[PDB]
Design a protein around this ligand. Sequence first.
Ligand SMILES: CCCCCCCC/C=C\CCCCCCCC(=O)OC[C@H](O)CO
Ligand SMILES: *C\C=C(C)/C=C/C=C(C)/C=C/C1=C(C)CCCC1(C)C
Ligand SMILES: CCCCCCCC/C=C\CCCCCCCC(=O)O
Ligand SMILES: CCCCCCCC/C=C\CCCCCCCC(=O)O
Ligand SMILES: [Cl-]
Length: 262
Amino acid sequence: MKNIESLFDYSAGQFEFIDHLLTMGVGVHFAALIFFLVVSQFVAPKYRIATALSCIVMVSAGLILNSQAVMWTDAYAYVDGSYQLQDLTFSNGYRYVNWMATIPCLLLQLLIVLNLKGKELFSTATWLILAAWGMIITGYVGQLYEVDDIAQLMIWGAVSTAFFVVMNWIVGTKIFKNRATMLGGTDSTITKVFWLMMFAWTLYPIAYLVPAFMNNADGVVLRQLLFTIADISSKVIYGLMITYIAIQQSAAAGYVPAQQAL
Ligand SMILES: CCCCCCCC/C=C\CCCCCCCC(=O)OC[C@H](O)CO
Ligand SMILES: *C\C=C(C)/C=C/C=C(C)/C=C/C1=C(C)CCCC1(C)C
Ligand SMILES: CCCCCCCC/C=C\CCCCCCCC(=O)O
Ligand SMILES: CCCCCCCC/C=C\CCCCCCCC(=O)O
Ligand SMILES: [Cl-]
């Protein structure tokens, strides 16, 4: 009721496209899960947790996308030529709470493949997770006002973006201070991962602002389209690059199953 999805009736095409986006996302994530599961054996024990975190991200994101898809079809019914709201079951907030768990996993596999260890990994991970949670919690409170108070959404978004900026500065600083430790030529691959993150993660605040510049049923479709692109890029494609780095460093470090896989 606090989100814009509940304000509109949807044509069969709008509704079915949203449903097909969420279901396609479920399919992509669970198919990648199998990939990450099977290739974890070609990863040296030092990096194997990284690929394991990808499996957790796939299932976590897949289950929430599957949840959203069923709530979507539970909330609406085709009545008099359009899908109209019938039950209070759909909300984007479930995406936000899920990020509390998936964003730490995404950040953690990055630090693992960067060769961080001991105190620094623990210290760096704690500040990154605290910043990320501050970003998500303020963003969560913000989207509660995307219908009733768009000014408050913009102010909470401003506070959330500050955490986002500080979070990226820590990530970027550690990447560029530690890329020289990376093996198998992955010191150049990790730089591409940082820019993939910058691009993919920034699509979320854009989707967050849709209610402010496209408050209509088409904006609801656009937001889900942006979520779908960001999810696939920040979770799947990102995970593939992390796994490639984990495997390439494993081989350069003398892990035979990795060398045999490459
Ligand atoms: C909400 C209104 C406030 C808006 C605020 C806008 C200011 C953006 C500033 C920084 C963004 C850059 C994010 C971090 C990018 C990487 C940082 C970096 O590269 O520094 C590392 C250095 O190279 C050592 O290795
Ligand atoms: C599924 C993976 C990730 C990394 C999800 C990331 C979400 C964000 C980076 C959200 C950022 C926000 C900002 C920067 C300001 C508006 C509120 C948001 C929470 C959407
Ligand atoms: C190698 C095996 C690859 C893994 C294949 C993954 C299988 C995914 C199967 C279909 C996704 C299920 C989602 C169905 C719920 C849709 C909800 C609805 O809109 O009614
Ligand atoms: C209050 C917020 C606290 C957040 C703390 C986060 C805790 C996680 C810190 C890093 C530990 C990562 C565990 C994986 C270690 C991998 C070692 C290995 O590969 O053998
Ligand atoms: Cl997620």
